[PDB]
Amino acid sequence: MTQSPSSLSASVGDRVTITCRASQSVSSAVAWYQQKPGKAPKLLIYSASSLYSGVPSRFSGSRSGTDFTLTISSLQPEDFATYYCQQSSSSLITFGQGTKVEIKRTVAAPSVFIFPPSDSQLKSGTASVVCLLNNFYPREAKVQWKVDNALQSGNSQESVTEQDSKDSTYSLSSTLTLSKADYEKHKVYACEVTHQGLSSPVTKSFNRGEC
Amino acid sequence: MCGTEGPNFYVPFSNATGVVRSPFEYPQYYLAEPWQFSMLAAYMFLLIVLGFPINFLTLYVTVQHKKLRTPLNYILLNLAVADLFMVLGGFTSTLYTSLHGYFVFGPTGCNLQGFFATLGGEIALWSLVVLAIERYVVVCKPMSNFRFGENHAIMGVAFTWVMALACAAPPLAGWSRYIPEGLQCSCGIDYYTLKPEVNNESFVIYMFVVHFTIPMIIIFFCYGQLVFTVKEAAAQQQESATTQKAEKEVTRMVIIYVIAFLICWVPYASVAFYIFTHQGSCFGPIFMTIPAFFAKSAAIYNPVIYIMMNKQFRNCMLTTICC
Amino acid sequence: MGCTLSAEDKAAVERSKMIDRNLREDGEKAAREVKLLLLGAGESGKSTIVKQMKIIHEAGYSEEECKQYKAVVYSNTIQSIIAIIRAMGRLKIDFGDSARADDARQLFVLAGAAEEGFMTAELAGVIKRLWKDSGVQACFNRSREYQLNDSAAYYLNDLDRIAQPNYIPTQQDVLRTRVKTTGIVETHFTFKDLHFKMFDVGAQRSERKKWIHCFEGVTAIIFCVALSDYDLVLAEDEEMNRMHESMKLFDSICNNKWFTDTSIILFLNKKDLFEEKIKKSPLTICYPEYAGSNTYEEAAAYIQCQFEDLNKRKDTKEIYTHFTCSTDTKNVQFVFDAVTDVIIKNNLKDCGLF
Amino acid sequence: QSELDQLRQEAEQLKNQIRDARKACADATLSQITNNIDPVGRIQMRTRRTLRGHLAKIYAMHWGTDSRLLVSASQDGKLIIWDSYTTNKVHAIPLRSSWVMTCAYAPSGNYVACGGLDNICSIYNLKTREGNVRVSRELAGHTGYLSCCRFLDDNQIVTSSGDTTCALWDIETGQQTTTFTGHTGDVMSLSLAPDTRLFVSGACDASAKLWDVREGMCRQTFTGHESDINAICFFPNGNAFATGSDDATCRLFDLRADQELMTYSHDNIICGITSVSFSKSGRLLLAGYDDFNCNVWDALKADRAGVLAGHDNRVSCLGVTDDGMAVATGSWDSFLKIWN
Amino acid sequence: VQLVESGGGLVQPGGSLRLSCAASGFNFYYSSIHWVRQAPGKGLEWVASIYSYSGSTSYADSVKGRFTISADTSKNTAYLQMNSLRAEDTAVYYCARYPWYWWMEKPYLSLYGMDYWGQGTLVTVSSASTKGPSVFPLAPSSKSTSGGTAALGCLVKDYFPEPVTVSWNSGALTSGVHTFPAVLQSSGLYSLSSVVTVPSSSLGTQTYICNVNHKPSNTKVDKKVEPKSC
Amino acid sequence: NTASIAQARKLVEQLKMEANIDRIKVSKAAADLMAYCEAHAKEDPLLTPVPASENPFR
Ligand SMILES: *[C@@H]1O[C@H](CO)[C@@H](O[C@@H]2O[C@H](CO)[C@@H](O)[C@H](O)[C@H]2NC(C)=O)[C@H](O)[C@H]1NC(C)=O
């Protein structure tokens, strides 16, 4: 048996509702933990209603059948982390898949940067070509790439940085691991990414072989 | 014929000597003794100044004291302020026309005064009978499924005033006629003078015999049944002194209702039947004089006896005048 | 303004009209209902009168009531066994079960107590397997002096029989389940077109302030005592006179400002045994002037003249006296014409004639 | 057996230690501190809404934390849930017996619980999917009546009862966890701090005890009253404790000073106290009387900033909303009137 | 109280180590100790537990039949023995305390939750032995967008071990940088990448140094970057 | 007879535990009361009157 939580993001001082629904009839043995990176799990609510000692009045909760609802009113800027749904009714102990909370930002124009590959890694025999589209929200984005006028799959890798505390935006790295012989077998590359967060795309074509 | 008539007047005295003239033109002082009708105008003044302050204190208990409100006191206040309206309009009209010495207002004034005075007497009667059946249904509990409320009260008030328009509809719509009577300073209803146009005798004896026969037997059988009920209830109980005090109170108070009501209302109907039956002879002015103002004395006689019964209103008026 | 929530508002107005219909029917059925209060001193007198008026019922006549005591018997079952385990946990001796898996069964049944559903065979297996340890019966012996319902073992052996489905148990389980005292017991019965409601007192207090002030609205009061109390022992000291505190009760009710205009009805339960002790023993204990005359018949008359003249100068109310009768049918007649008469008095004072 | 008298003498020695310490904290004059502030002035409030529908008395009233829904309990045997903004009903609930001496409402808004002379407290679920109101549990185990009971949290509730005890209840097991003993008189009222850690219990022994939830030990006793105690109210920070009494007087106590601060009365005020409630500011004091008049008191300057009236019969219940915009009242007049 | 883990380390396939969590100041006989697996990039899975009062214990279904556990209540030290490790078993292990029975200690309210949590430690399964880093320098092109950022960074491939300590660009450059997290490549090891937000006009005057600083591997690599037209 | 000396023992022990309790001076406690009372008296909704549109009851 498993359970199906949900995820949402909101602005400062906005009420957020997290729902953890069960599969079968379970008694009131449910706990909610906060997990930010670099910290241990902290217990917030036990037996699905009662609050732990030291937690302020901002948190609430409820029980209806097997549906459980978490309510956070009067949101603080420091409270952004994953929240886990926990079951403790049988000797087997099930943990949830976890949620996330992100801060809503005013929309702004992102920047795409094309970086030509340096000759040092090329003469060193292994290189990576990266087209950085930075300063963008939402979190979800997908990058597509063509190689010698053909799209390939399986040779691509990705990376995600945390939110900058000042710029309040994201920088995501997509990295290709290709051999040197594939670069002699390579003539043309073009980076074009389109997503909902950007209002209008721009066209980009710059090929290797220009210094 | 014993006298003369015109559009709306009749005089029972002989015109064989040719002295009789129109009632609204010259003073008619030969017809009766001067000091007696002057003096009866003076006790009309004494009667209105006697009658007003109990009505005023009734208005003061009506507005000031909220504790005494109940569905039956709607009926009692209806009797009171209705009696205010009739005594003011009709009876101040009588006082003013008696003050001028003869008939000054013209036909319309005593048409208006006529249906006000007569409608006042009969709404007094209908208020008494609806009070009687209301007390009977409340205290006696004929059937289990009823409890008292506003509905039958407002149906009683509306019933009383549609009886008022029932009494007012023939003289207003053109189906009946008003004339002066007696000392011709008041306009009531006729007994002898014949009108071939409408021939109003048959339905005025209809309304007479119905309105006479129904309420008195209603009051008699209902109050008799409740008095016997209280008597047998005392007869089975036999230990509480308050019970025989209660049967004594309802016994004295009910029998004074019957003798007071009987004496005040019945002789007008009696002389109405005997004058309507014996049409061959014409009678002296006192027979045309006494039932009218004796009925008006009954009209001022009703509020004191029918208000005084409740010890709550007695305590409120004594507290009101003592403070 | 949206039309749909406005229609929810007017829908709340017509549903509120349905609520108003419930208030109308409830208020009329309350307003026509005859209310009378019950007090008393002796347990035997009140129990004699209320069991005398009791008409026999069947405990199991309705399957909906069967579902009711399924819930109540399940409540006493689970509540009993959790009381047993927490009673063991409140002991300072280390009393655990030999089989460690049964403790997992016990934590699982503390989890299983919370659900609102029906009883399953596994929980009954848990409480029976834990119940098969005789040290649990030793803990019944220890917990005999603590907060516990004393029939508890019968509920568990009974539930061993109840484990099979589609059972119907007999009357004594239901009646035994309602063997409890506290709370005020209300009774409803009909005699000659009038619907009566009685409110007794459990005797829960000697002192009466708040719940005695909330009994303000009532038509009549029934007060019952045994006149034989001068020969009856109700004492922890030398002074055994029950009639002193009984007259303290009667004077306490009559001198209370809330009940100034409401009457009192008064009964004397025991008379035969009383007459035999009149021959056996003279009533000299109370007053000599009371015992001016030897003869047995007028000995009652002093009691009703004393309890009758204990009124404090009030004549709007009168204390009705009655005597014990062989048949209940004569008793309800006195209540009947008594409450009929006082209703007639109230209507007469309401009309303003008396 | 005479050793009890010996420890009574040592107890009296601790009592004279108490009067010496309370004298040492009684060195200072409060009148100077109350003198150093400006007066507020006359306050006039008007009845903006009135409520109907009850055919009997009003013995209970309690607020929700959302400041919309009000619950009122009559002794004809019905509960009705109010909407205060639009004057609409929400639910109507019949119960087994007409004896109702208290009511409560959930901080979460999901539950409502009542009780009375029948020794059985019932908690009701409002968000059930079937569209009605159902009896979830019936809690019993007391021998007397229960005067007041209120939720601290959704998992565990506190009642006060007529067997001179207090008790902590758990809903899911339906069995009491912790009981509190030590009174000789009946417990008349109850109030708990906003921090939910401490609740105080009034009694008819003219005393008050400060009870703790987790440790189960009465820490401080407050005595010095001449009559029974009817209502209790806490200051919003939890540092001040106010008491009502029968003889038309009210006193304020401090937990940290351990001495009474100021007694409120007047020569023309002879009728007892039926309810006490603060405001969010704590400057104002509301109190109900038996002679139909609710005086509004200044807490610091001890003078009446105004007088409100307009009820015909005795006031039973008084309270304020959590957001501080309104004061609700209830009476034996079978009508509710809110002041703004 | 404090829950302190011990016995961890980085493990090869086929090996075995003993995991331990120390109990400090609380009764160990009346509680249970729990161990969970935190996979990289994913949530939390529960695997094993030790019950002291009854003695029976429960295992995860995928893991049961391999591990065995024992504990000594007198020394306040619980042990976990892990055997038959596989490559997917890399996870961070947290020591956690759940009270099963709350009444036999003292009369307390019912509880359902993890009271005290340890700080945890990383255990991995890898056949990749310790290797020094292979750092590949980058250089910005001459044909670029004025006003953009120049790519002054370094591709650090085939480095070991993790976790990493926060020290970049020889102390002078503490703000304005975005460094990328490592991802698993086809060789089974991790790689690093970084870019610095530099104004385009300042390339002639200011230069930056990649410092690959890893404390347990004793690795200080100064890698020189040179300007080229690309 | 031993029950009431047991209650005497509970009495003297709760009074001995009651003996070691901090006792704040009434001056600074009064300063606390007047300080909260001035603060939320300036934030008082029933002392500062409400506009007719800002009033939810109107
Ligand atoms: C009563 O009858 C006499 C008859 O003598 C009426 O008197 C006559 O009135 C008319 C009016 O136009 C005069 O023309 C006559 O000259 C009068 N006759 C006389 C004085 O002998 C008298 O009007 C009648 N009364 C009425 C109708 O009220």
> SS in 3 state form for A150-176?
CCCCCCEEEEECCCCCCCCCEEEEEEE
Q: Which two tokens stand for residue F4?
A: 């009431």
In eight-state DSSP terms, residue A95 is B
Distances from the Cα of E153 to the Cα of A56, C51, E146, angstroms:
45, 99, 18
* Largest CA-CA distance found in chain C, in angstroms, rounded: 91
For B94, the 3-state DSSP assignment is helix
Residues paired with residue D222 on neighbouring β-strands, in sequence order: D208
Residue B14 located in a structural domain: no
In contact, C80 and C149? CB cutoff 8 Å: yes
In eight-state DSSP terms, residue C290 is G
Q: Do D279 and F44 touch (CB under 8 A)?
A: yes
Residue B226, C-beta contacts closer than 8 angstroms, at least 6 positions apart: B135, B136, B139, B140, B250, B254
Contacts of D110 in chain A (CB under 8 A): 62
Q: Name the residue with tokens 């037997």.
A: B217
CA angle B247, B253, B258 (to 5 degrees): 120
Count of structural domains within chain B: 1
Alpha helices in E151-194 (DSSP H): none
Q: Is C276 exposed, middle or buried (0-12, 13-18, 19+ CB in 10 A)?
A: exposed
Residue E133, C-beta contacts closer than 8 angstroms, at least 6 positions apart: E156, E157, E158, E159, E160, E212, E214, E219, E221
Asked whether the CA dihedral B134, B140, B146, B148 is positive or negative, the reply is: positive
User: Is there an atom of ligand 1 within 6 Å of B312 CB?
Assistant: no
**Cα–Cα distance, A87 to A31 (Å, whole number):** 7
Crossing angle between the packed helical segments B150-173 and B106-140, to the nearest 10 degrees: 150
Q: Which two tokens stand for residue B144?
A: 């289990």
Number of Cβ within a 10 Å radius of residue D266: 13
Breaks in chain E (C–N beyond 2.5 Å) sit after none
Q: Is E73 exposed, middle or buried (0-12, 13-18, 19+ CB in 10 A)?
A: middle
CA dihedral C285, C288, C289, C294 (to 10 degrees): 90
Distance B17 CA to ligand 1 centre (A): 9
**DSSP sequence for D58-79:** EEEEEE-TTSSEEEEEETTSEE
Closest C-alpha residue for ligand 1 atom 8 = B18
**DSSP sequence for F10-46:** HHHHHHHHHHS-----HHHHHHHHHHHHHHHHHT-TT
Count of structural domains within chain F: 1
- The residue range of the domain holding F21 is 1-58
Contacts of E118 in chain A (CB under 8 A): 40
What residue ranges define each of the domains in chain D, with the CATH number in brackets?
4-339 (2.130.10.10)
Q: Do E110 and D173 touch (CB under 8 A)?
A: yes
Distance B18 CA to ligand 1 centre (A): 6
Among B15, B19, B24, B25, the mutation site with the greatest number of ligand 1 atoms within 8 A of its Cβ is B15
- The residue range of the domain holding B101 is 34-322
Query: D58's torsion region: left (phi>0), alpha (psi -120 to 50) or beta?
Result: beta
**Cα–Cα distance, C48 to C54 (Å, whole number):** 10
Distances from the Cα of E160 to the Cα of A10, A96, E217, angstroms:
39, 32, 7
CA dihedral B191, B195, B198, B200 (to 10 degrees): 10
Does E181 sit behind a cis peptide bond, omega within 30 degrees of 0 on the bond before it? Answer: no
What's the one-letter identity of residue B95? L
**Cα–Cα distance, B268 to B208 (Å, whole number):** 11
What's the one-letter identity of residue D83? D
**DSSP sequence for E53-120:** SS----B-TTTTTT-EEEEETTTTEEEEEE-S--GGG-EEEEEEEE-S--TTTSS-----S--EE---
Question: Which atom of ligand 1 is found nearest the CA of B20?
Answer: 25
**Cα–Cα distance, D189 to D186 (Å, whole number):** 9
What residue ranges define each of the domains in chain C, with the CATH number in brackets?
36-55+182-351 (3.40.50.300), 63-169 (1.10.400.10)
For C185, the 3-state DSSP assignment is coil
**Cα–Cα distance, B169 to B163 (Å, whole number):** 10
**Cα–Cα distance, D58 to B211 (Å, whole number):** 51
In contact, D302 and D308? CB cutoff 8 Å: no
User: Is there an atom of ligand 1 within 6 Å of B218 CB?
Assistant: no
In contact, D139 and D123? CB cutoff 8 Å: yes
Distances from the Cα of D54 to the Cα of A99, B54, E116, angstroms:
49, 39, 53
B201 labeled binding residue: yes
Distance B280 CA to ligand 1 centre (A): 25
Distances from the Cα of E61 to the Cα of C337, E90, E92, angstroms:
81, 17, 19
Contacts of B139 in chain C (CB under 8 A): 344, 347-348, 351
Closest CA to D97 of D111, D115, D80, D82: D115
Residue B103 sits at φ, ψ, to 5 deg, of: -80, 105
Domain CATH code at residue F43 = 4.10.260.10
Across E123-162, b (16+ Cβ under 10 Å) vs e yields bbbeeeeeeebebbbbbbbeebeeebbbbbbbbbbbbbbe
**Cα–Cα distance, B11 to A106 (Å, whole number):** 107
Q: Which helix (H) or strand (E) holds C195?
A: strand C194-199
Query: A148's torsion region: left (phi>0), alpha (psi -120 to 50) or beta?
Result: left
In eight-state DSSP terms, residue B90 is I
**Which of F13, F21, F22, F46 to mutate to probe the D interface, most D CBs <10 Å?**
F46
**Cα–Cα distance, D174 to C116 (Å, whole number):** 12
Closest C-alpha residue for ligand 1 atom 21 = B18
Closest CA to D312 of C193, C125, B67: B67
Query: C92's torsion region: left (phi>0), alpha (psi -120 to 50) or beta?
Result: alpha
CA angle D158, D164, D165 (to 5 degrees): 35
Closest C-alpha residue for ligand 1 atom 19 = B18
Q: Do E56 and C104 touch (CB under 8 A)?
A: yes
Alpha helices in chain B (DSSP H): 34-64, 71-86, 92-100, 106-140, 150-173, 201-237, 241-277, 285-307, 311-322
Residue B4 located in a structural domain: no
* Largest CA-CA distance found in chain E, in angstroms, rounded: 77
Closest CA to E105 of E24, E27, E2, E22: E27
B239 labeled binding residue: no
Q: Is F1 exposed, middle or buried (0-12, 13-18, 19+ CB in 10 A)?
A: exposed
Domain CATH code at residue B93 = 1.20.1070.10
For E193, the 3-state DSSP assignment is strand
Q: Which helix (H) or strand (E) holds C74?
A: helix C63-89
Nearest to A29 among C104, C111, C117 (CB): C111
Residues paired with residue A147 on neighbouring β-strands, in sequence order: A189
* Largest CA-CA distance found in chain B, in angstroms, rounded: 78
Residues written for chain D: 340
Q: Which two tokens stand for residue B226?
A: 């409740």
**Cα–Cα distance, F7 to D182 (Å, whole number):** 9
Residues 160-219 of chain C with CB under 8 A from chain E are none
Closest C-alpha residue for ligand 1 atom 18 = B18
**Cα–Cα distance, E230 to F9 (Å, whole number):** 93
Does A110 sit behind a cis peptide bond, omega within 30 degrees of 0 on the bond before it? Answer: no
Distance from CA of C236 to the nearest CA of E (A): 39
**Cα–Cα distance, A187 to A174 (Å, whole number):** 20
Determined by: cryo-EM
Number of Cβ within a 10 Å radius of residue A72: 19
**Cα–Cα distance, D239 to E77 (Å, whole number):** 45
Distances from the Cα of D167 to the Cα of C82, C117, D163, D217, D259, angstroms:
18, 28, 11, 13, 28
Q: Do domains A2-105 and A106-211 have the same CATH topology?
A: yes
Closest CA to E140 of E212, E211, E197, E221: E197
In contact, D207 and D178? CB cutoff 8 Å: no
What's the one-letter identity of residue B11? V
What's the one-letter identity of residue B318? L
Closest CA to C269 of C40, C34, C91: C40
Number of Cβ within a 10 Å radius of residue C244: 12
Distance from CA of C106 to the nearest CA of E (A): 10
C103 touches chain A (CB under 8 A): no
In contact, E142 and E229? CB cutoff 8 Å: yes
Residue D96 sits at φ, ψ, to 5 deg, of: -65, -40
In eight-state DSSP terms, residue D220 is -
In contact, E208 and E173? CB cutoff 8 Å: yes
Q: Report CA E43 to chain centroid distance, whole Å.
A: 14
Crossing angle between the packed helical segments B285-307 and B106-140, to the nearest 10 degrees: 40
CATH 1.20.1260.10 matches A106-211: no
Give domain A2-105's CATH number out of 3.30.70.2860, 3.30.1330.100, 3.30.70.2470, 2.60.40.10. Answer: 2.60.40.10
Distances from the Cα of D162 to the Cα of D192, D207, E230, angstroms:
19, 16, 92
A28 touches chain C (CB under 8 A): yes
Give chains near B: 3+ CB pairs under 8 A. C
In contact, B156 and B136? CB cutoff 8 Å: no
What's the one-letter identity of residue C281? S
- 3-state SS of chain E: helix, strand, coil percent to 5? 5, 40, 55
**Cα–Cα distance, D156 to D176 (Å, whole number):** 10
Closest CA to E39 of E58, E21, E62, E65: E62
User: How do beta strands D198-203 and D166-170 pair?
Assistant: unpaired
Distances from the Cα of C353 to the Cα of B57, B73, B253, D129, angstroms:
21, 13, 8, 57
Closest CA to B159 of B116, B129, B120, B201: B129
CA angle B113, B76, D53 (to 5 degrees): 130
Q: Which two tokens stand for residue B299?
A: 């009209």
* Radius of gyration for chain E, computed over Cα atoms and rounded to the nearest angstrom: 24
Distance from CA of E119 to the nearest CA of A (A): 6
- Sketch the domain layout of chain A as residue ranges: 2-105, 106-211
Asked whether the CA dihedral A75, A78, A81, A87 is positive or negative, the reply is: negative
Contacts of C343 in chain B (CB under 8 A): none
For A4, the 3-state DSSP assignment is strand
Interface of C with D (CB under 8 A): 9, 12-13, 15-16, 19-20, 22-23, 26-27, 30-31, 75, 79, 82-83, 86, 110, 113-114, 116, 147, 182-184, 186, 204-205, 210-211, 214
Counts of helices then strands in chain D (DSSP H, E): 2, 28
Residues paired with residue D306 on neighbouring β-strands, in sequence order: D296
For C283, the 3-state DSSP assignment is coil
Residue E204, C-beta contacts closer than 8 angstroms, at least 6 positions apart: none
Distances from the Cα of F18 to the Cα of A202, B233, D18, D48, angstroms:
78, 71, 10, 49
For E132, the 3-state DSSP assignment is coil
**Cα–Cα distance, D146 to B68 (Å, whole number):** 39
Residue F45, C-beta contacts closer than 8 angstroms, at least 6 positions apart: D280, D323, D324, D325
Contacts of A91 in chain C (CB under 8 A): 104
Q: Name the residue with tokens 């937690």.
A: A55
Contacts of D154 in chain A (CB under 8 A): 49-50
D239 touches chain F (CB under 8 A): yes
Closest CA to A190 of A144, A159, A152: A144
